[PDB]
Amino acid sequence: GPMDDKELIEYFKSQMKEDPDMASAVAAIRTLLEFLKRDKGETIQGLRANLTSAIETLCGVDSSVAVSSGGELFLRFISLASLEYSDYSKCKKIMIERGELFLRRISLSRNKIADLCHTFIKDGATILTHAYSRVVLRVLEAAVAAKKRFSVYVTESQPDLSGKKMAKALCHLNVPVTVVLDAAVGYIMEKADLVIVGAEGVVENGGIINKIGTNQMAVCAKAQNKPFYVVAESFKFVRLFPLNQQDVPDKFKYKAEEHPWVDYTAPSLITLLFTDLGVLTPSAVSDELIKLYL
């Protein structure tokens, strides 16, 4: 049909490359909606199947949790829209309008998270971060714009040195930052006042899926009574319930000796989550997911 796999991959990669600030999940949702724009279908069943296959191949392109989260969120949005309108033409118009509004709303979640999270940073505080994260950079920018002075520590993230990139991006706005080894998490924990990390995916029970080194930092902060804050967008709410590290699906661990790319952090190790919905406890994510799915 229209826009086969090659065009879908090309559009996804073009959206990712044109705006490096935009997250992978936002680009995936944009690609799915723009696929919805030109489908030339007559039934909602074929539309749902085509969208499912598009999500499958998009997750084949990128093995991140956020892409799958966006795909499931888009499928739920399509089902909710179909629930209200029986005629396919009116349903499609409503889906296009609601998708445009949804894209507008999710394009500005980062600023809302920054405005709601920068208040938790105190003057002269020592902030510990794990790896590169656009949301953490944005909240630190908002805190700097508030005429607040603080120091930041970041790990180097050995697999790909995104910690160095985060350090350069923070030096860009004149923020005193330090780069430490991934093995120096426990050593430097006693100097940090609070820990702020991002998340690639928020699981059902309130835990998070994040870069491979997040669990160590969370456990070390728990052992020293340090607050552990997670900044994450709403579209990263996954209905997954891992029981341990081995229970994480293998499609997210690898291809993104034994070198997993992500790990899971339990809700008991997290103080608060900063989302576009607000400041939440880990118990609120499960309530949101339950409310979404009837």
Binding site: A81, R98, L277, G278, V279, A284, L292
Partner: protein, 333 residues
Amino acid sequence: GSELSERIESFVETLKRGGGPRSSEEMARETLGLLRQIITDHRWSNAGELMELIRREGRRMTAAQPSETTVGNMVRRVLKIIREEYGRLHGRQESLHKLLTSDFSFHYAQLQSNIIEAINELLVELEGTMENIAAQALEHIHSNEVIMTIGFSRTVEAFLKEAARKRKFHVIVAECAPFCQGHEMAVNLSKAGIETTVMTDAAIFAVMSRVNKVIIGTKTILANGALRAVTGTHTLALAAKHHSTPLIVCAPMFKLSPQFPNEEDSFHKFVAPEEVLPFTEGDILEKVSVHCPVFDYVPPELITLFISNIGGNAPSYIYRLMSELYHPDDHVL
């Protein structure tokens, strides 16, 4: 008009200078009455003007004494009531469902009556809060139990007095220094036949190994389930957590504040150093820093159960209750 202005000024000055309504329920009732008088007497056309007026008055009262969260809670409850009435009379929360599936200038003649009757219903529910909380005492206290309390909480006093009508137990009261109001609680409980012990806060840990559960009151409940309690309550909570001793907070629903613990340096109430170090010390007072915080911050992970007029709840559910009482746009006020 003039009488309303005098009442507002008197309330603000009483809040600024302390004293006034000793009971938190009395303060909530007075705040609700003041808001009702503001709604009745002041002239407004649509819901927006009324909301702005209430916002200004609540800002003034909150700035008068930031530690008294009951006034701001009442202001936000009235604002939420106004919003609900306007939505019911005009039309037909942030969530993933609302995000996926996709104006107060209109005037209505019967909106004011609905607001007034809703406020009256809220006051009526407020009058019976203490009895509702105390009616659950028997479900949480068994025979020959040991209960630990700190300071003087009227809700906890009613709880224990109701429980003592049918069960025998021991109550340990720690005097919340410097204002040792725990002595009044101890003598009041002893007057009701309950066997009570008086001790200082320094012994809170020492006797904690022989305590079955802890029942305490609070001044404020934060959005994450944290507590603004009397000073020394954080130490008591830590001691209870060390022994896995359950900690029960008997707090009415009107003490829930949609604020978060991000605010600093205004949380605790600092009073004159005379309560801690007397003025008769002499020269050494010139070079000694004396601080007397009245209130303490208790993290939600140290609290086991919240007992309110609607029943028992876990701290992890507090947010939902906070979603049912206050609109997210009124948190800043």
